[PDB]
Design a protein around this nucleic acid. Structure first.
Lengths: 222, 215
RNA sequence: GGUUGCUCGACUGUGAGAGGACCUACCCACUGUGGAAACACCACAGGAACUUCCAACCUUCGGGUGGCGAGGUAGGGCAGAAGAGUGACC
């Protein structure tokens, strides 16, 4: 099917400020369905936010946002909007968009979801990651990686060899440095033989900063 | 007043091919306006059951919903490894809509000892005055592990941080990255940096280590 | 002048269990299914039950057909009718 949902308009936002999340509908027209926003604070659970009703434009709000958020839809643009004013820290989340399916088929279930846009209410300013190389050693497979240090806000993305190296790769979840910044590291394992002949580059992208870094990871120099 | 969805357990470890029952209890009658979702890390939710008992198009038959009064129960007759997921109930019988706090499921496999490596801080880093030592515990299970940093045989404390991967749904295992962090000055004070792993698969605590400077 | 038939009739009525079902149009409603539909808009089916009624149609006078939102607002139906007449008869 072509049925798709595309969120956009999230990111770092100061407390007290405003955003407007957009949701772009592809495989279906939103005018015949009910459309709902659902958020999820990091590593917390799903929280229902607002919804609007087909044929009536009736809007219903979670009470934790009532009077600070407003839901809406433009039929023509087959888009649904979400205006978030006077945001606070706890508004931080991935904000998902979902289609309540057609009653005859899926009852009141939410049968298609977007990939969600991440909203990051804080005053601390954006910084991009210094990227350092985790060099391998002796003792038939060894491991090498990259250290993605002291960035903010989430997310960064790591790929190896421009995505050509996918197998054996573990990009750890960021942890929160006491600087408030993020650090994380990615690691791949490879048979020791490839060391001298195989170029190994990690690719690090932190869009909030517009930072793209490519760090060639080579063995011990001596 | 808000209908509450109170779902238990918070978490569930089980074997492949077990039966797993997740329960949700609506604070008020919600008829059968209950639906069940499967959410795997970083992915958006997926629909499983929609009229408390009705299997969504394409969902495996091993899943099934059920109402009994205001008690709703999802039920996987036999776990497959892929079924690793946090599961949520939702009530859509009134407004505001409401979700359960969700139930994180885990695979279960035989024991796998951690592969262990240790990484000395990169030369670029030390120039900028920072010094991170990284220790890696690879592809092990069960995840409960104890990492201990010793600097010149001094157990460290409060200067390490670790993060853990989810269960590789194909592997059903875990990986961990414990990172010791110091000022360049504190780093240059000690020769030996050692990372002491204790795990059930290891009959003896494995230590990888290095000396500052060795090529 | 009684009495009583015949006609025009101001106006009042439509009576709820020991007893209220007349018609039509608007509005306004109450309840469920359905409309790509949790509310709103729409179409449709329905106003607990047992009963009571026939203002309505049909009848071979045996009985049959059809019919309920006690919501308003109007036009009518059916029932009275104060008054007008108007006869017959005493």
């Amino acid at each position: 099917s072509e049925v798709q949902l595309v969120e956009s308009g999230g990111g770092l936002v100061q407390p007290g400020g405003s955003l407007r999340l957009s949701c772009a509908a592809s495989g279906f027209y939103i005018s015949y369905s009910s459309i709902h926003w659902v958020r999820q604070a990091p590593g917390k659970g799903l929280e229902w936010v607002a919804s609007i009703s087909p044929y009536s434009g009736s809007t219903y709000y979670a009470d934790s946002v009532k009077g600070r958020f407003t839901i809406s839809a433009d039929t023509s643009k087959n888009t649904a909007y979400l205006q978030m004013n006077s945001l606070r820290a706890e508004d931080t989340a991935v904000y998902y968009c979902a289609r309540q399916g057609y009653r005859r088929r899926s009852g009141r279930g939410f049968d298609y979801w977007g990939q969600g846009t991440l909203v990051t209410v804080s005053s601390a300013s954006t910084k991009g990651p210094s990227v350092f190389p985790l060099a391998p050693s002796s003792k038939g497979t060894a491991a090498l990686g990259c250290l993605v240090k002291d960035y903010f806000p989430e997310p960064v993305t790591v790929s190896w060899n421009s995505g050509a190296l996918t197998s054996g790769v573990h990009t750890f979840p960021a942890v929160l440095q006491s600087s408030g910044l993020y650090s994380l590291s990615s690691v791949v394992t490879v048979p020791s033989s490839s060391l001298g002949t195989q170029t190994y580059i990690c690719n690090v992208n932190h869009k909030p900063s517009n930072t793209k870094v490519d760090k060639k990871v080579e063995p011990k120099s001596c | 007043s808000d209908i509450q969805m109170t779902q238990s357990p918070s978490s569930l470890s089980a074997s492949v091919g077990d039966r797993v029952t997740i329960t949700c209890r609506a604070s008020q009658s919600v008829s059968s306006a209950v639906a069940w979702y499967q959410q795997k890390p970083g992915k958006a939710p997926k629909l499983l059951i929609y009229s408390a008992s009705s299997l969504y198009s394409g969902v495996p038959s091993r899943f099934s919903g059920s109402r009994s009064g205001t008690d709703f129960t999802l039920t996987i007759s036999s776990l497959q490894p892929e079924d690793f997921a946090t599961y949520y109930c939702q009530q859509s019988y009134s407004f505001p809509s409401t979700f359960g706090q969700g139930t994180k499921v885990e695979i279960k496999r035989t024991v796998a000892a951690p592969s262990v490596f240790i990484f000395p801080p990169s030369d670029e880093q030390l120039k900028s005055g920072t010094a991170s030592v990284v220790c890696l515990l690879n592809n092990f299970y069960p995840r409960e592990a104890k990492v201990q940093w010793k600097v010149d045989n001094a157990l460290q404390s409060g200067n390490s941080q670790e993060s853990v991967t989810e269960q590789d749904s194909k592997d059903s295992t875990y990986s961990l990255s414990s990172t010791l962090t110091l000022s360049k000055a504190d780093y240059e004070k000690h020769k030996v940096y050692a990372c002491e792993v204790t795990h059930q698969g290891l009959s003896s605590p494995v230590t990888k280590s290095f000396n500052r400077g060795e090529c």
